Amino acid sequence: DYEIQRERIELGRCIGEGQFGDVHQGIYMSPNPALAVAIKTCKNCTSDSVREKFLQEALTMRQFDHPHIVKLIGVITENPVWIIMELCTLGELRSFLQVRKYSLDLASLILYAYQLSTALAYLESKRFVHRDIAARNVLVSSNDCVKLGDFLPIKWMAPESINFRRFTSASDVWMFGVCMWEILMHGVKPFQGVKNNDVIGRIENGERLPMPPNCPPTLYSLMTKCWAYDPSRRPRFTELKAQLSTILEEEKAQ
Ligand SMILES: CN1c2ccc(-c3ccc(C(=O)N4CCC(CCO)CC4)cc3)cc2-c2[nH]ncc2S1(=O)=O
Numbered sequence: 001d002y003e004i005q006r007e008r009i010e011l012g013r014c015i016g017e018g019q020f021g022d023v024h025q026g027i028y029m030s031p032n033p034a035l036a037v038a039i040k041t042c043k044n045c046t047s048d049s050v051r052e053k054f055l056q057e058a059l060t061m062r063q064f065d066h067p068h069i070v071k072l073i074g075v076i077t078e079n080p081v082w083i084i085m086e087l088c089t090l091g092e093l094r095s096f097l098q099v100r101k102y103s104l105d106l107a108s109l110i111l112y113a114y115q116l117s118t119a120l121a122y123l124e125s126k127r128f129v130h131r132d133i134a135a136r137n138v139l140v141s142s143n144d145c146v147k148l149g150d151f152l153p154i155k156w157m158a159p160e161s162i163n164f165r166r167f168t169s170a171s172d173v174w175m176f177g178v179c180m181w182e183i184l185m186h187g188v189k190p191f192q193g194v195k196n197n198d199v200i201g202r203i204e205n206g207e208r209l210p211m212p213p214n215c216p217p218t219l220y221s222l223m224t225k226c227w228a229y230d231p232s233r234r235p236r237f238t239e240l241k242a243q244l245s246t247i248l249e250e251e252k253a254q
Contacts, residue, residue, distance in 0.1 A: 002062070004028070004074035004084055011039060015091070020045070020054045025087055028073060036087040037073055045081035058083045060151045064126070068119035070139060070147045088139035088147055096140045097187035104143075107251045110219065112138075112146045113180045114244040119148045120176055121237035124169045131167050132156075133175035135182035154196040155189070159229055162200050170231035176240070177226025184212040184219070203229070219247050 008029045016023040021041040028035045045051040061072040073084040090096055093112070097104070116138065123130060130151075137150040152162075158174035160166040178190050190209055191199060208227050211220040222243055228234045235243070 002072065002074035004076055006076055006082075009037070009039065009076070009082070009084065020050070026084075028084060035073075036089065038085045038087045040083040040085065042081045046079055051077075051081055054081060055083070057151055061085075064123075064128075064151075066119050066122045068115045068145075068147050069122070070149050086141075088141045088149070090140035090142065093135045093138040093140055093146060094182070094187035097135070097183065101186040106214065106216070107248065107254075108143065109183050110216075110244065110248045110251050111144065112183050113219075114241070114248050115146050116148060116176070116179065117237060117241040117244050120172065121241045124172070124237045129167050129169055130172050130175075131161075133172055133179050135179050135187060138179070152196075154199050155191040155194070158231065159200060159203055160231055166231075168231065169237065170234050173226050173234045173237065173240070174231075176237070177223045178209070180219070180223050180226075181209050181212060184215045203227075216247065216251065218250075222247070 010027040010029075012025045012027065014022045015025050015038070018040055021043040024039045024041065026037050026039045028037045040054075040057075042050065042054045045054055055075060055077065058072055058075050061070070065071070070088065071086045073086060075084065076082040097109075120130070120133070130148075132150060132153060133148075134153060134156050137148065139147050139149045141147055154162060156175045156178045158166075158171035161171045161174075181190060182188065191202075194202070208224060211217070222235075222240065225235055226240070
C-alpha cells in the first residue's frame with residue numbers, strides 16, 4: 001500500500017544520524033518525477049526483532065495527517081530496510097535557530113510555536129500523547145514552516161511524569177511550554193548546568209525557566225500557564241493555539 005519499489009528511490013548524502021542508523025536525503029520518482037525525501041536507514045534490520053521496532057515508527061506515523069507533522073511517504077521492508085518520509089529541507093530546529101539567532105524576526109519564532117500548537121491540538125483530538133515534546137524533535141521545512149518529527153528528558157518533563165510516570169495531554173502541554181521557551185531562546189537547552197535530579201526540587205520551590213530576552217510578556221505568560229504544577233490548571237492545546245494566533249497577529253502588526 002505504501003511499500004515503495006527500491007528502484008524509485010535514489011539514495012543521496014547522509015544528512016543525520018538516527019537511533020537505528022544514518023538518515024539520508026534522496027529523490028523519490030513516482031507517477032512527481034523528482035520528490036525530495038528523507039530516508040531513514042537501519043543498520044541491524046537484518047534481525048527481525050530490530051526490523052519490527054524500526055518499522056513501528058512508520059506504522060505510528062501512518063495514522064496522522066497534518067500540515068505540521070512529518071508525513072510518511074512509504075517503506076521498503078526487505079534488506080536494507082528503509083522508511084521514506086517527506087524531507088524537511090532546513091533540518092533540525094535547534095541548529096536552525098542557533099545560526100539565525102540574529103536574523104529570524106520574532107514573528108517567525110511565534111509562528112513556529114503556533115504551528116506546533118496546531119499539530120499538538122490535532123494530536124490531543126486524536127487522543128494521542130506524545131511524551132517527548134522538545135525542540136530536538138522539531139524539523140524545519142521552510143523559513144515559514146516547522147513540523148513535529150520523532151514518534152529520560154527530565155528537564156522537559158512535567159512534575160507528575162517525573163514523580164509518578166503519569167503521561168497525558170496535560171503533561172505534553174508542560175513539555176510544549178518548555179519547547180516554546182527553547183524557540184524564543186534561539187535553541188538553548190533548558191536548565192543548562194543543572195543536574196537532572198535537582199530539577200523537580202527547583203520546580204517544587206516554585207521556580208520556573210525565566211523570560212527569554214526579547215520575548216513578549218504575553219507569550220512568556222502563556223508559557224508559565226503551561227507550567228502550572230497541577231495538570232488540571234494547564235490550558236488545553238486548543239486554547240494555546242487560540243492564544244498563540246492572537247499573539248502572532250499582534251506581532252505581525254508591529
Ligand atoms: C530526524 N530526521 C531528519 C534529520 C535531519 C534532516 C536534515 C539535516 C540536515 C539538512 C541539511 O542539509 N542542512 C544543510 C543546510 C542547513 C540550512 C542552514 O540553516 C540545514 C541543514 C537537511 C535535513 C532531515 C530530517 C528529516 N526530514 N524529514 C524527515 C526527517 S527524519 O529522518 O525524521
